[PDB]
Point group: D2
Chain length 290, copies 4
């Protein structure tokens, strides 16, 4: 099936699946963010009604092809509340329609937009983080490298939840192991698919904005990377952390037992995803303390 | 060297090592708890001045031979504060002086003492947890099984931080792997030592109060077990969790990369120990919500 | 399988299942002789495999797997023939008595007795008594490891080398990471439930699990004959197998552990169909050949 | 070692170091002949090892390891003699040209050329052209794997089997879990710094790392000759080695991967001193023997 039809299914599936969670929150404001060639949508979650609050940029997962604001709305509500920070979930553009660079560029613009319109949003400028799951973690990681290179220091902390950091063809042992098994949640055939729908040409994969791990990782904001024991992205996510730390950037990698890829997403239904969001939040909260 | 001299060294070492952390807190009350054949000491940490607060029983580590209230005072202060619960650190009796049963019995009495004198302590009875690191995790696990068997339901949540759950002679692969390496923090020779100083006879090790994992683990309070990638107790700690969950008891096992045994203890100096205490707390806090 | 059923009928289903395996391969061997070995209470069968016709030949005692309840000389006849011809050794496969009928140390005792029988009957066998090794798979590896310990405690030095194929060396409830990981998997050839059942059929009193003749890993493994330990990546026994080789080495005995990728417990029996079973068998035969050089 | 020093002098320290290894063992072989093989730009040396004196013998091309910068026929003379006598094959060790002097595809080209030379000179060699295999360790395994791919793309079917000992199959910066874990360890025989340096000495333009003749793992591994892949538990190359066997299998080619416990990269070279190096060598010789049966 066509990417458009898998996208409409994953959406139906997820809403259908989260017609129950009730994640309380304070205010939610839906915004529009100017990007090259138009605008995108974002949703800001206010934990309280106050001034100078920390802010987190959440980039949803979905292989650069799926996912939406609504798709990770529950996750963002709980974060906002548990970390007590504003969360601006970004509806970055999706592939095969908008190919590689694009998603990465809006994620970056979003971030920038969030710091310049921060009085408005009632957010503290010197206290902003970037989080994301799967393809979102990637964007969160790349965005963090753009902020580094740019030298604007907008990112103070990062939370990579099962990031894909290597889009090359050089597989990992966990990649193959959990990509092939008869009980994964992230078929190797589907990952190779994501890649095709997103990258124009495939050496684009050797680019640092596509594969964040191939980049020099010195000089980056403190990072919290979460992994799943039975996730094909496990080795890479954990290797991302090692590398940051070896290059002088602070990193902590926590791996949850018995979990599969995308488990935080089923948090209202799996305990481990609860303990993981609770951690993400606590990590953000301490990371953004003045 | 004699157990007494290793005990005086570990103490000097730790205080010496934590002459800096400043863990703020609200009030601390040092108590005396009646046990069979005398009394023991405990230290209660108040996070705020209030009524009906959740409470956590912290059992310090040290192989049933070392450790003290002062030795894990920093850890207990931060917990209290981050979880916003009372923490009563228990100076259970230590081996070769007081051998196996004893430590386990005071840990249990402590727990009981804490629920009956709870109006006094200003603590909520229906909201109590048990936490502990290394030998302390063991005690926390055993105490949780005593509460189960007893049927009093005093324990609502448990936080096993690198628990030793198998004191038998049936080694684990991680046990051997990280017990022998040229860079562990938990020499296999020293563990075999702990065992000798604590157990009278060595089949005592096959007893459930010595080796919590050999027990049937159905019907236990929700548990959060934390492991270290380079810890000889890793496999057992993670196996403890699997077993609880297989027997119908809820459990989540999180393993931190690059860490060694006893790392939370060096939290003010290692980031991963920070992220781990932050998690312990968040786990306790959600676990004790009415 | 289904342990819901009796051991004897399960022994039958297994027997038919395994012989479809020996049927698929033609393994030449210069000769065979079915023998009857004296043990306490009678005799057990044994099949002697002759690689060539000569004197002073090296020999290998082979103990078949089957969880102490299944298996027979027939069940592992292909493995033994191939083993025999590649190492150029006399292989004698032992039909040790089975549980639940005959319970634990029996088999161990039959095994050790079969070893003494070979050394005593070496001239009649065309064997060089100073050149003997022991080998086996699953429960068979246990027997081989225990037999090596018995041979050591006795100070006779009959066992010059031991080849343990996916051996079970720990029969207590203290699980390993691999024990549970592959014991519980949906794709397991050695379910945890079946392993638990083997023990109930084999041991009379659950604390016999603590005897070294049942859980060899609990013994002092120093001073043992050189060991070659073969394990499988998805075998629940994997960890205890490697733990055993390490422990031996740490105690001064020589041991080498090899892990076959992509394999499950019992893959050697399927050698005709699985390339890896065949590579494993060739390593074993080469390991024996070299271990038995004068 | 110290890469702070030049390649040529490091090549010397290594040469002396490795020959203390060949010195420790006496490995009989019916015969040897040092030969000179024609390649683009001249000739490379090769040493032919004859196991016995006969016609129609099976043969194995052997490519020594050394990170494409070190090693020589002398450096692996013991391994080849032993390999030769245990498989009963003619082994021809190739002295392929080294980097940095001669850079990447050279060695690959020397290797493939050495393979064609053996098949063409088989009658003069007492070899059965239909029974040839290739083998090697570290960079030598790379050459053997690449040679197998070249032999396949050519459709000549010269390679009947390939034995890859702790092969390096990926020369890009995309690390594996094992690559970093053992590359950075204090107890590593293959530091990450040295691996990075080998690549700079071997490749002229860093994106050649993406060519299949350098990073065989990137090729379509379907339709290749049977593979036996040997890895070590603490080898940084461990994961890519096993990844390679799996990929081959998933593509329809036959492959078997064996992981030796407690070993580091290069343990086979130390076979005289390490029991496991010896067991590994015997598996390889047995794997070739069986793979080359008519």
């Amino acid at each position: 099936a066509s990417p458009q039809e898998l996208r409409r299914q994953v959406e139906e599936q997820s809403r259908l699946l989260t017609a129950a969670v009730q994640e309380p929150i304070a205010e939610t404001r839906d915004v529009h963010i100017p990007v090259s060639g138009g605008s995108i949508r974002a949703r800001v979650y206010f934990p309280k009604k106050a001034a100078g609050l920390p802010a987190v940029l959440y980039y949803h997962g979905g292989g650069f092809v799926f996912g939406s604001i609504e798709t990770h709305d529950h996750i963002c509500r709980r974060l906002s509340r548990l970390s007590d920070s504003v969360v601006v979930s970004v509806d970055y553009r999706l592939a095969p329609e908008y190919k590689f660079p694009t998603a990465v560029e809006d994620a970056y613009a979003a971030l920038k937009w969030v710091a310049d319109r921060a009085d408005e949003l009632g957010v503290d400028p010197d206290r902003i983080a970037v989080a994301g799951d799967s393809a979102g973690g990637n964007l969160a990681a790349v965005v963090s490298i753009l902020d580094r290179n740019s030298g604007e220091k907008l990112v103070k902390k990062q939370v990579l939840i099962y990031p894909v950091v290597n889009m090359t063809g050089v597989p990992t042992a966990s990649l193959v192991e959990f990509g092939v098994a008869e009980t994964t949640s992230l078929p190797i055939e589907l990952m190779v698919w994501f890649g095709r729908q997103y990258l124009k040409r495939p050496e684009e994969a050797y680019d640092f904005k596509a594969s964040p791990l191939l980049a020099d990782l010195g000089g980056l904001p403190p990072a919290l990377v979460v992994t799943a024991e039975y996730d094909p992205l496990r080795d890479e996510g954990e290797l991302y952390a090692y590398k940051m730390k070896a290059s002088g950037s602070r990193a902590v990698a926590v791996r949850f037992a018995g979990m599969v890829h995308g488990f935080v997403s089923f948090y209202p239904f799996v305990d481990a995803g609860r303990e993981a969001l609770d951690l993400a939040a606590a990590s953000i909260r301490s990371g953004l303390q003045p």
